[PDB]
């Protein structure tokens, strides 16, 4: 009758930790197959009914929104990994659950959770010291130009893909697109656009900002496209004749007043048209559509105008032209007007495309894709994005380590050999920590269809002989030196992954009870 809980759910002890360990594996299973470039995809549907298909561990975890709190901790650790690195969310979540899986039977055998944390904190620090030891700085290897090595990195990431034959052409432009930016590199600054039809060689490398230019209204044979120093207007105003937004419905009882009302409704479009010309905007780029009449206005005034621009391309032009977005047109002045050296309409692929070039704030560019279908350009959009990240990270940090699970097997060797010389309960735990590192190369083999048993066993033998960089080759079903293959990753990224992985496992292992306030 007088009950202590009264509907309050709560449990503690070994059953609580084992319960949280199984929930952590459920989150890894949702992103276990997405590991690698050739990883399997995941389909997610929301209440709207639209499906999202992608193998991005960061985007997948944001969409699941699991209610279990141990899972919320892993998902939150991925967000800190994005701000810290921007990638490695699948490795952190997949590797953190592997530490929990290996210490699961020892927890059941009565080993205290606190003793497990001392091993993770110890083995992690020993691993970080080994990463900085094995990590090599590569700036002028054999006096080779950095553009040459950076192309070998992007070619290997794009090898065995839809652009496999023309990977060299895509390799040059990817490096050139990254070289076009300033010192403060950024992935969001570069855009990638798609153009249906045509061969892969016809893919253009735009220097400035561009957009699809869905504008298909009247006003042809006029509007001289070329400009040497135009003033680019950034607006979201609709200049349609009968606009859904702007109208004038004035009911009167006089014929003479209707002539002014029909003209006054026309004056709203004309006054807005004149305010654009009043400030001297040579290029009018609007978010909303524009009517046929407004096209004839600027066509007569020696000015260009084309609406139906997405919001992203405008804001990407905001950082490029050096102006600002102005929804209105009355206060349009030089403080929001842009500048560029060459603005010209190009007919790449038959469709009209507008682009700027040589702007003062030209901190962006655009990559046009040419292929036989849309999915070839959608896969190539992200496939080249991976190569852009590889080229970016090599410029930022020159200290790197062999990818493809090569470092995970050396740390598995060092920590396993170090655990042997550690008397106490830390021996089996540091050894379990070592064996947990082998899940990264094991899934790269499973996700690639290869036999993980034969490769991981052959790979462990090569590491015992002295191979400090051998790992998994996604293309050929064999062991290959990822360091010689220019498959590199930064040393700090691998450090922050183990730190975030160990911190996540320790936080879950340090938990004993889950309390729930009924409210």
């Amino acid at each position: 009758v007088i009950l202590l809980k009264e509907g309050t759910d709560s449990s503690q002890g070994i059953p609580q930790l084992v319960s949280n360990i199984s929930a952590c594996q459920v989150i890894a299973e949702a992103v276990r197959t997405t590991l690698g470039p050739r990883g399997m995809d995941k389909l997610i549907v929301d209440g709207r009914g639209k499906a999202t298909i992608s193998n991005d561990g960061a985007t997948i975890l944001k969409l699941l929104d699991v209610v279990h709190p141990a899972a919320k901790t892993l998902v939150d650790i991925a967000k800190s990994q994005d701000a810290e690195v921007g990638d490695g969310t699948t490795s952190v979540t997949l590797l953190a659950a592997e530490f929990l899986k290996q210490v699961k039977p020892y927890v059941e055998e009565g080993l205290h959770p606190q003793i497990i944390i001392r091993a993770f904190r110890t083995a992690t620090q020993l691993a970080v010291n080994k990463i900085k030891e094995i990590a090599v700085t590569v700036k002028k290897a054999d006096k080779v130009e950095q553009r040459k090595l950076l192309e070998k990195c992007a070619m290997t990431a794009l090898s065995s893909k839809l652009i496999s034959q023309q990977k060299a052409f895509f390799a040059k432009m990817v490096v050139d697109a990254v070289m076009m930016l300033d010192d403060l590199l950024q992935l969001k600054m570069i855009g990638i656009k798609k153009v249906q039809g045509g061969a892969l060689e016809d893919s253009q490398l735009v220097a400035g900002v561009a957009f699809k230019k869905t504008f298909s209204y009247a006003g042809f044979e006029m509007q001289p496209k070329k400009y040497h120093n135009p003033k680019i207007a950034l607006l979201n105003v609709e200049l349609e004749l009968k606009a859904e937004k702007d109208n004038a419905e004035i009911r009167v009882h006089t014929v003479e007043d209707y002539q002014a009302i029909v003209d006054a409704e026309w004056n709203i479009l004309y006054d807005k048209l004149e305010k654009i010309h009043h400030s001297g905007a040579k290029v009018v780029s609007s978010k909303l559509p524009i009517g046929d009449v407004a096209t004839q206005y600027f066509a007569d005034r020696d000015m260009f105008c084309a609406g139906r621009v997405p919001e992203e391309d405008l804001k990407r032009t905001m950082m490029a032209c050096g102006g600002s977005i102005q929804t209105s047109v009355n206060a349009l002045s030089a403080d929001v007007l842009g500048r560029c050296q060459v603005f010209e309409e190009t007919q790449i692929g038959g469709e009209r495309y507008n682009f700027f070039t040589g702007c003062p704030k030209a901190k962006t560019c655009t990559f046009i894709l040419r292929g036989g279908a849309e999915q070839f350009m959608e896969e190539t959009e992200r496939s080249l994005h991976d190569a852009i990240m590889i080229v970016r990270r090599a410029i930022k940090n020159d200290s790197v380590v062999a990818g493809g699970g090569a470092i995970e097997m050396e740390l598995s060797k060092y920590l396993r050999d170090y655990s042997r010389t550690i008397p106490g309960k830390q021996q089996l735990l540091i050894g379990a920590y070592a064996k947990a590192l082998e899940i990264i190369p094991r899934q790269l083999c499973d996700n690639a269809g290869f036999d993980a048993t034969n490769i991981l066993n052959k790979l462990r033998a090569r590491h015992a002989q002295g191979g400090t960089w051998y790992g998994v080759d996604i293309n050929n079903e064999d062991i290959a030196d990822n360091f010689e293959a220019f498959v590199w990753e930064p040393a700090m990224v691998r450090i922050n992954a183990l730190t975030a992985a160990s911190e996540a496992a320790c936080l879950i292992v340090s938990v004993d009870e889950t309390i729930k306030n009924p409210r």
């Binding site: 042997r420 052959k458 033998a461 015992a464």
Partner: protein, 433 residues
């Protein structure tokens, strides 16, 4: 399908034979070692048999399962061939099947697992033969095994002289150490220090420097008659002066034939080994009788089986490190098989540590650390050939402590355990009629 019986296959049948073999090991897991706990055996009648011997349990245990019966037949082969190690064989085999069943769940075929166990057992025997110790502290040997321990060197010095006096070839220059040669007795004379060694046979009978020792069995100076002597015939021996005795035991005459004082209430006819234990009370000296015969046999098994090896899990801890390093040299799907063979051997020091009421995860880790340092470099700062102290609960150099076993036990126990795991793991189907 229409058949007069049943049929079944898959992972469950290998697991059923694994879960069956694991049950037999757990029945004799806690009874491993000298401090093994006793176990009851309730027959269908209702009676109860209590003992701690793992070999005795398996012979009397009855479990209706084919896989379990293989381990019962396995223990009989190891018993008749050697007569020791049947408990460790059943436990080691069950652990190999446990780890093997886990590999089969990882898409590791049994033929790859079997090929690894055949390699791990082979190299393990080579590593064992490389780190043996041959017949060569005999005061410290029986000391560790031995209330008699209050005076270590006093009682133990008599044991090394007893076991050495019995040294005799008896076959083609074999020399062994016979068992029924020492005659341990007791007394209560004035102290526990008056116990004395005797270099001769102590005959418990009652009625001279005559070399003639007459040995006769038929019924009627040192004349022995097993069939008894009539009353009148004793008078004729007094005429010549013979020390003739009647009603001589059969077992005594065999020792007297092979061989050739004022004692409390039974004066012994000494021929001029044996040790008469003069004590204080029956409680103290009676325990000293069996305490001498026990540690005397431990020294006997060392000097008989000329090749021995350190016990206490020293072998299993060393093989766990060597086989783990040898695995990386082979590859070809044999790493996980040989690597899991290494972990399976750790059950012996893990089981003995639990039976000794100690943290097995600590002792097994401390035991592997010393053996690992032995493989890194041959320097003397690195500890070598370390075992387990079951009394104190800590590592101990069994080379000095005198804890050894015959080499054939540790060698054949791995061969029998590997052959049984292979026999059970090769099964992949069940057919009933």
């Amino acid at each position: 399908l229409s058949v007069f019986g049943d049929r079944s296959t898959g992972e469950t049948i290998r697991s059923q034979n694994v879960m069956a073999a694991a049950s037999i090991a757990n029945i004799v897991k806690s009874s491993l070692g000298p401090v093994g706990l006793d176990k009851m055996l309730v027959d269908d009648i209702g009676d109860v048999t209590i003992t701690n011997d793992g070999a005795t349990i398996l012979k009397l245990l009855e479990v209706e399962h084919p896989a379990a019966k293989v381990l019962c037949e396995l223990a009989d082969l190891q018993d008749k061939e050697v007569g020791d190690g049947t408990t460790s064989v059943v436990i080691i085999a069950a652990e190999l099947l446990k780890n093997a069943d886990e590999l089969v769940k990882q898409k590791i075929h049994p033929t790859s697992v079997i090929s690894g166990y055949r390699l791990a057992c082979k190299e393990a025997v080579r590593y064992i033969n490389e780190n043996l110790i041959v017949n060569t502290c005999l005061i410290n040997a029986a000391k560790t095994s031995m209330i008699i321990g209050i005076n270590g060197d006093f009682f133990a010095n008599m044991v090394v002289d007893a076991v050495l006096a019995i040294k005799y070839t008896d076959i083609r220059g074999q020399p062994r150490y016979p068992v029924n040669s020492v005659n341990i007795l007791k007394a209560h004379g004035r102290s526990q220090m008056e116990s004395m060694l005797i270099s001769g046979y102590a005959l418990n009978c009652v009625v001279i420097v005559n070399a003639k020792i007459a040995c006769l069995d038929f019924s009627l100076n040192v004349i022995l008659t097993t069939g008894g002597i009539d009353d009148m015939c004793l008078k004729y021996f007094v005429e010549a002066g013979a020390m003739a005795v009647r009603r001589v035991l059969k077992r005594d005459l065999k020792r007297i034939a092979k061989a050739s004082e004022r004692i409390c209430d039974d004066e012994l006819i000494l021929i001029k080994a044996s040790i008469i234990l003069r004590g204080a009370n029956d409680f103290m000296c009676d325990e000293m009788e069996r305490s001498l015969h026990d540690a005397l046999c431990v020294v006997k098994r060392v000097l008989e089986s000329k090749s021995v090896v350190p016990g206490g899990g020293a072998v299993e801890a060393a093989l766990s490190i060597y086989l783990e390093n040898y695995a990386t040299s082979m590859g070809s799907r044999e790493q996980l098989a040989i690597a899991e063979f290494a972990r399976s051997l750790l059950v012996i020091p893990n089981t003995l540590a639990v039976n000794a009421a100690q943290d097995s995860t600590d002792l097994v880790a401390k035991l592997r650390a010393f053996h690992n340092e032995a493989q890194v470099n041959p320097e003397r700062k690195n500890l070598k050939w370390i075992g387990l102290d079951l009394s104190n609960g800590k590592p101990r150099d069994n080379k000095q402590a005198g804890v050894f076993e015959p080499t054939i036990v540790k060698v054949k126990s791995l061969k029998f355990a590997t052959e049984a795991a292979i026999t059970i793991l090769r099964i992949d189907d069940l057919i009933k009629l």
